[PDB]
Design a protein around this ligand. Structure first.
Ligand SMILES: NC(=O)c1ccc[n+]([C@@H]2O[C@H](COP(=O)([O-])OP(=O)(O)OC[C@H]3O[C@@H](n4cnc5c(N)ncnc54)[C@H](O)[C@@H]3O)[C@@H](O)[C@H]2O)c1
Ligand SMILES: NC(=O)c1ccc[n+]([C@@H]2O[C@H](COP(=O)([O-])OP(=O)(O)OC[C@H]3O[C@@H](n4cnc5c(N)ncnc54)[C@H](O)[C@@H]3O)[C@@H](O)[C@H]2O)c1
Ligand SMILES: NC(=O)c1ccc[n+]([C@@H]2O[C@H](COP(=O)([O-])OP(=O)(O)OC[C@H]3O[C@@H](n4cnc5c(N)ncnc54)[C@H](O)[C@@H]3O)[C@@H](O)[C@H]2O)c1
Ligand SMILES: NC(=O)c1ccc[n+]([C@@H]2O[C@H](COP(=O)([O-])OP(=O)(O)OC[C@H]3O[C@@H](n4cnc5c(N)ncnc54)[C@H](O)[C@@H]3O)[C@@H](O)[C@H]2O)c1
Ligand SMILES: [Mg+2]
Ligand SMILES: [Mg+2]
Ligand SMILES: [Mg+2]
Ligand SMILES: [Mg+2]
Lengths: 334, 335, 333, 330
């Protein structure tokens, strides 16, 4: 049983905690955030988009009990000052959004701190970046800091990989139509990151925004390095997203071939569907990516093809499911 | 002064009426819908997304007065039974969504009916389809039924045209991230048109849906016939939309060239901006299409280019502005 | 007991879902205005209530749910539905269009159904049941009964508890309520002539009428004529809350009021002290969930106004009550 | 009179907009926590209140509005803002963080401060056209009260003057605001409800408006209490008051009394409007006669009265009325 610590008990932190309850041999013994146990316990119990917690939660001194079992809560602002080892913690899920680099994540690793760190976000080009079931084979267990990549990367990767392996990808442009997130303002106001679009009311607008997922795909699928770019449209749903990829391929294809190739690539991480679903239908799913064969296009004009492939993801639970798969596997080979 | 009738006093019908108040050559003397004048007057006065009506509205017997001037209201379900001529109406705006074809729209044209019809939607391949300032020159005035095209078509057309004229378009795929509309269900329920996605709660989902705008662009820009296809993602804003086009071109280009070409093509119908705006910023605009230079991409990989161009539109007011431009012009030249 | 659903809508579909976990009641026929593919899809996927717990496969003239076939018809007139063909004794009338004794009775003819449960208020000549508040008024001989409204099932146990413990003189109710299918998605002509329900339901606070308080006498006779109220419809797709401001026959404290509600708690009436919000009550099985955090007792110059507040999922809370009433009725029929 | 804005937020920016159409009041300095580009962009484009009516051009250390330069600073501490450099006599304190006499007084600084929120019991609290007569101009710190107080006050006052109020309970069905989280997360103020996704929930929350009404209408002191239900609209609110009165009344009498009390601050309507219809209005409070109830049971009456307000523009309109008047008598 590997003992895990969560830094940043936010959307990803709390959902990771929920999934970990059904993973034998991984257990959370410590949570660090910037608030009291009552706030954190309440947010675990009740969840607007992901439903009521499946179990009991009872606030205690310095923490809370989940199904009888105590979990320590601290409010330490600096990772360097978190004494993870006190609670037996070997691996930290770094889920704050503020320490997503090798140098900053490593602050968790000190005397009486943690041994290893999994960043719940892109962590820079000097940190191994893992999409479970696409490139988790790059791990040997000696790594001190790893990255679970982004929500959009975990969605895009198996879809793009399948295209590459089957047909060959020349280039592609991606658009993600994406749920609003906590880095957007609830109402028009000064954005601390200087983004004039994330400054705007997130639940009342279509909001264009940048994403590096397509550009950084090379870190996950080397052979696609430099081939993909993209962007996002943030829209008023509180969770649930979809990724469209328009690509040129090395082989002529049909819609049926493309869909069949995706179905053949399906596994625990990459789902396949032919039902005409909408975003609420993918909230809480455990696939990292859910290919939607109903949205496939292959456009042939004067012998030239553009291919459109589309995959759903719950930017919350889909990512978290992938994250916990990567955490479990990493813990077992550490 | 050409007298106009509105069939379907809905989102497009009511907004068209609003714009017509500031058009000298044209006036609405009759509205036909499926309800009483009180309902229609209230909906004209108060508008969730487009604001309070600029003027006075007072309910009367068989109609209502707008700034003193009476407008007749009928509730006739069948276009054949609407006596448009009684109120001097020559041209009907067919805005119900139920008579969007040549055969069905022509029902307005009978003895004591109207002379001509403008469909506020695609109207089939046998009806001239107009995007104002892109192909309104195809009109000679002898037409009995014309189409103002769709919201997405009026957005896409000047953007695509500019790409064609400057660089040449080989092919392209379009996605419109689009406001929910009245053909979607407020909550999950049986959809009358058999669409399993429009059956879903429109203000609580990202909803994929089909659109023929890209496929039917040939009707507006003949040289793009067969070159474009696309689809929609309907999302929870009550109005305001954006169209992304990913295309291959006949010339190698840069981002700066593409943006400069759009700016050079700008007019009353096609706007240009470099401000990082969001959808609420385009609600109520009078451009049919507002090109956003901040979203342009030109991706070069192994010498091959994909070009991404993006334009905003208020599916309500942008379209309506184009519609009324087309109506005004058509009314001037009508024979 | 074999059951038929007329109107496979929000309440119809959710009732079907709950019935899967009720032994001895089963749905053998659905009637609506569409094809089986539309209905099966809507059962499988649900924006506010989640993916269906089971398998659904479309067939000719119906669909299979966990292997078991359910017939689908598209008959517009209740008189023309041959319920008896599929063994149906009791019809859930869930369309919203036949909510009266005379209209509901159209289901009852020779190869039709025997009995009808209207999923809405059904008039003063139809017994109106809020399960665990007045289901004892049923003897099983009734041909048409009413499961009341969402707001009535929320209000009733809360008001009853006030009456039994302290005595109610009078009260005014406000329900802050999810938007529903009778509102327009965007501003447009409303078929019922309501100038407020004509407005975009997911983009406005929309005042609207409700008869729940006024009709409470049908459920709790001793409160007849004592309560009135209204609604504010707001942009959540499901989930509602009922506030009642009342004068009572006894002086009280906040703690007494809350303790009385807790003592009245059962399968239909829940009690909570957690500061929850509407998403937390989506899908609950209580008809009414009293929220002790929102209680007020205001004393000014010796006079008291008492505020009590209860949550309800206008969808699942009501449906849970409806199916409790259906199950019980079916047992004693 | 030259004015400074501390906190260029929803109220700050909207106050700036209204001030453009007030002769003899002018904003020469803005202080916030960001660069001029961010502030200029937020002035230009507004999700709920529309595009700015004029030109805005970013400059070094500020921006130009219709040609006229406005200085922007990013000073976190009010004590360190050199307001006097830009001629500023009166500061609109609109951050939400300095809403007390001691904290507001921290403002070569300014002479006087108007807090855009309740400011404590030792600060004069003004609802324009209800109690602005309490000002003599010698005050250093004043309060424009809250959005809900400006809505409730003229409605309650009218009830008191006409019929007499014994007691009442208020519910405001209120737009979500910036103090709520966009998605479920730790709330810095310790509020377990404001922690929740504001645009995806009905969220109960406290409000002191009813309890503090005594500061505006002394004769109602101790008579009113209430609470809020925050709901998913980005602006626009409504206040319901259920009250017992000293006189027996009818619905028609109550409505007629409200109509008779109508002025620039207190509007009257009989149209069955919804919240989008009141976005951007200039009334502090808009009485809705369609929602009135008078319930008589065994000779005893409960009276329900309801008024709309744009928590943003209705409040701001009142705030700028109070600012203008205060500036003139200072
Ligand atoms: N939400 C998503 O869709 C999503 C998907 C994939 C990846 N991510 C990534 O996960 C990370 C967190 O995102 P989120 O959506 O959960 O954010 P969130 O705001 O919900 O949660 C962040 C949490 O971190 C806490 N925090 C902030 N600073 C801290 C500090 N110094 N010490 C301890 N705790 C601190 C906050 O109090 C908060 O509880 C980010 O890196 C984000 O990019 C998010
Ligand atoms: N809303 C948009 O974004 C948009 C944009 C471009 C084009 N359009 C098109 O405009 C048309 C109307 O769209 P809308 O969004 O205004 O719809 P809407 O539903 O708001 O209005 C349609 C109106 O027609 C009325 N109606 C229905 N059947 C009728 C009949 N038989 N006779 C008379 N009136 C009848 C209804 O009462 C309703 O008021 C459609 O063809 C639509 O595709 C809409
Ligand atoms: N949604 C709620 O919160 C709620 C709560 C309590 C009670 N109710 C009541 O339940 C009833 C239905 O409400 P809903 O929200 O489920 O409505 P809904 O619109 O979701 O469902 C109504 C269904 O009836 C069908 N229908 C309409 N006319 C028909 C006909 N002639 N024959 C057969 N089917 C027909 C429609 O196709 C639709 O599927 C109403 O009486 C309503 O007041 C609703
Ligand atoms: N929005 C409403 O409906 C409403 C109505 C009435 C009153 N108010 C009150 O107005 C005040 C502001 O409310 P808002 O909704 O505009 O908030 P907001 O968050 O929109 O604006 C606050 C602004 O102040 C800035 N700020 C924060 N700390 C600062 C500091 N130390 N120095 C300088 N600037 C700082 C922020 O960057 C932001 O631009 C609060 O007191 C609030 O209670 C709000
Ligand atoms: Mg475990
Ligand atoms: Mg005119
Ligand atoms: Mg069963
Ligand atoms: Mg001025």
């Amino acid at each position: 049983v590997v003992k895990v610590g969560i830094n940043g008990f936010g959307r990803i932190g709390r959902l990771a905690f929920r999934r970990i309850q059904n993973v034998e041999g991984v257990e959370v013994t410590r949570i660090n955030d910037l608030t009291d146990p009552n706030m954190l316990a309440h947010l675990l119990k009740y969840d607007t988009t992901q439903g009521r917690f499946d179990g009991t939660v009872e606030v205690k001194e310095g923490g809370f009990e989940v199904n009888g079992q105590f979990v320590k809560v601290s409010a330490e602002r600096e990772p360097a000052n978190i004494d993870w080892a006190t609670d037996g913690v070997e691996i930290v899920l770094e889920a704050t959004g503020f320490f997503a680099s090798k140098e900053k994540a490593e602050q968790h690793i000190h005397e009486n701190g943690a041994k290893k760190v999994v960043i719940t976000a892109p962590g820079g080009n000097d940190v191994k970046t893992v999409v479970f079931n696409t490139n988790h084979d790059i791990l040997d267990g000696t790594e001190t800091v790893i990255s679970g990549a982004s929500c959009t990367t975990n969605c895009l990767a198996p879809m793009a990989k399948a295209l590459q392996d089957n047909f060959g990808v020349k280039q592609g442009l991606m658009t993600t139509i994406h749920a609003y997130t906590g880095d957007q303002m609830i109402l028009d106001g000064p954005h601390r990151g200087g983004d004039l679009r994330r400054a705007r009311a997130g639940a009342a607008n279509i909001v264009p925004n940048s994403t590096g997922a397509a550009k950084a795909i090379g870190l996950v699928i080397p052979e696609l390095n430099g081939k993909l770019d993209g962007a996002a449209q943030r829209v008023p749903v509180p969770t649930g997203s979809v990724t469209e990829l328009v690509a040129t391929l090395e082989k002529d294809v049909t819609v049926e071939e493309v869909n069949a190739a995706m179905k053949a690539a399906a596994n625990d991480s990459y789902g396949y569907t032919e039902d005409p679903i909408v975003s609420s239908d993918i909230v809480g799913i455990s696939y990292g990516s859910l290919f939607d064969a109903t949205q496939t296009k292959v456009q042939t004009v004067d012998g030239n093809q553009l291919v459109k492939v589309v995959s759903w993801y719950d930017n919350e639970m889909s990512y978290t499911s992938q994250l916990v798969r990567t955490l479990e596997y990493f813990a077992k080979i550490a």
